[PDB]
Design an enzyme around this catalytic site. Structure first.
Site, short mmCIF file in Angstrom:
data_model
loop_
_atom_site.label_atom_id
_atom_site.label_comp_id
_atom_site.label_asym_id
_atom_site.label_seq_id
_atom_site.Cartn_x
_atom_site.Cartn_y
_atom_site.Cartn_z
N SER A 161 0.82 -1.21 0.00
CA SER A 161 0.00 0.00 0.00
C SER A 161 0.86 1.26 0.00
O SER A 161 0.49 2.27 -0.62
CB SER A 161 -0.93 0.02 1.21
OG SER A 161 -1.86 -1.04 1.15
N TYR A 216 1.61 3.09 -3.12
CA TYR A 216 0.60 3.94 -3.74
C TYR A 216 0.56 5.35 -3.15
O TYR A 216 -0.23 6.18 -3.60
CB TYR A 216 -0.78 3.28 -3.64
CG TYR A 216 -0.93 2.03 -4.50
CD1 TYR A 216 -0.48 0.79 -4.06
CD2 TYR A 216 -1.49 2.11 -5.77
CE1 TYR A 216 -0.60 -0.34 -4.85
CE2 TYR A 216 -1.61 0.97 -6.57
CZ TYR A 216 -1.16 -0.24 -6.11
OH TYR A 216 -1.29 -1.35 -6.92
N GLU A 225 -4.32 -9.15 -2.17
CA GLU A 225 -5.10 -7.94 -2.38
C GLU A 225 -6.51 -8.23 -1.88
O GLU A 225 -6.99 -9.36 -2.01
CB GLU A 225 -5.17 -7.52 -3.86
CG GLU A 225 -3.84 -7.23 -4.51
CD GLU A 225 -3.97 -6.50 -5.82
OE1 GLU A 225 -5.11 -6.12 -6.18
OE2 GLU A 225 -2.94 -6.29 -6.48
#
Ligand SMILES: Cc1cc(N)c(NC(=O)c2cccc(-c3nc4c(C(N)=O)cccc4[nH]3)c2)cc1C
Ligand SMILES: OC[C@H]1O[C@@](CO)(O[C@H]2O[C@H](CO)[C@@H](O)[C@H](O)[C@H]2O)[C@@H](O)[C@@H]1O
Length: 234
Positions: free
Chosen positions: A129, A132, A213
């Site tokens: 994460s 991102y 995910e």
């Protein structure tokens, strides 16, 4: 407002006016508390090995309650398989994320960039994460969310699908990674599973994904719990 909260407001943008803009109660988590130690463990143990560009270092931990979000999450709080998962984004998005919550791409939008269709994506590996946030050496501070996600019955997939419709009885998608946090280390904070185990081999080899995910296709299956300010050391 506490200094850490003021610095957070300045990061994502006078102060109290913008804070009211966020429509979100933000509170600092004691560094010496057990919430903080659980979160720091989660961060330390779930840093993948293919993301060796940076080391992560927690600066601040905030407990956040978005207005209306708990009343909206209600129908899923008894839902089994609730899980505390990461979500990263560019600092610029966070003003919106807190005022409007994580959202879904509009019904008429291309699906080609969405490995598992237009939904809300999460990881259980912090670095997955943190990628991102798109921070860099020139700006090595970013923000990651920890959300309680009502996963329910997971549709477990090994390869991209690019659609947003689940079979009946399924509530979420789990993209199966070759690596998963050791399930023997999972702990339950406030009824919610925290997969803070060190990464171990999942036993899946028939898969496209290095790491798990988790995708949900209803914005009411998300309840944002924490917001971390992270220093990336490259
Ligand atoms: C300015 C801006 C613009 C756009 N378009 C986006 N969105 C995407 O690039 C996009 C599209 C599809 C899937 C995913 C995605 N996110 C995650 C995450 C996460 N987030 O921790 C975790 C695990 C798997 C993920 N798969 C991301 C984000 C930002 C900041
Ligand atoms: O439950 C919320 C959300 O789940 C979806 C798929 O993401 O459908 C699932 O949940 C429904 C309500 O319980 C079930 O009827 C359905 O069988 C199940 O797939 C969406 O329809 C909904 O927004």
């Amino acid at each position: 407002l506490p200094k850490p909260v003021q610095d957070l407001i300045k990061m994502i943008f006078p102060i109290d006016v913008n804070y009211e803009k966020l429509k979100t109660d933000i509170k600092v988590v004691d560094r010496d508390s057990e919430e903080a130690e659980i979160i720091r463990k989660y961060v330390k143990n779930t840093h993948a090995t293919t993301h060796n560009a940076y080391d992560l270092e927690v600066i601040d931990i905030f407990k956040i309650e978005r207005e209306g979000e708990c009343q909206r999450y209600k129908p899923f709080k008894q839902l089994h398989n609730r899980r505390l998962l990461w979500h990263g984004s560019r600092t610029t998005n966070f003003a919106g994320i807190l005022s409007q919550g994580l959202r879904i791409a509009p019904p008429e939008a291309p699906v080609t960039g969405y490995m598992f269709g237009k939904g809300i994506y999460f990881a259980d590996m912090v670095s997955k994460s943190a990628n991102y946030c798109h921070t860099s050496q020139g700006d090595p501070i970013g923000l990651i969310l920890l959300g309680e996600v009502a996963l329910g019955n997971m549709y477990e997939l090994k390869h991209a699908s690019h659609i947003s419709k689940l079979p009946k009885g399924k509530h979420s998608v789990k993209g199966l990674g070759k690596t998963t946090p050791d399930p023997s280390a999972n702990i339950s904070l406030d009824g919610v599973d925290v997969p803070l185990g060190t990464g171990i081999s999942s036993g899946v080899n028939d898969t496209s994904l290095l790491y798990n995910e988790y995708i949900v296709y209803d914005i009411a299956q998300v309840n944002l719990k924490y917001l971390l300010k992270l220093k990336f050391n490259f």
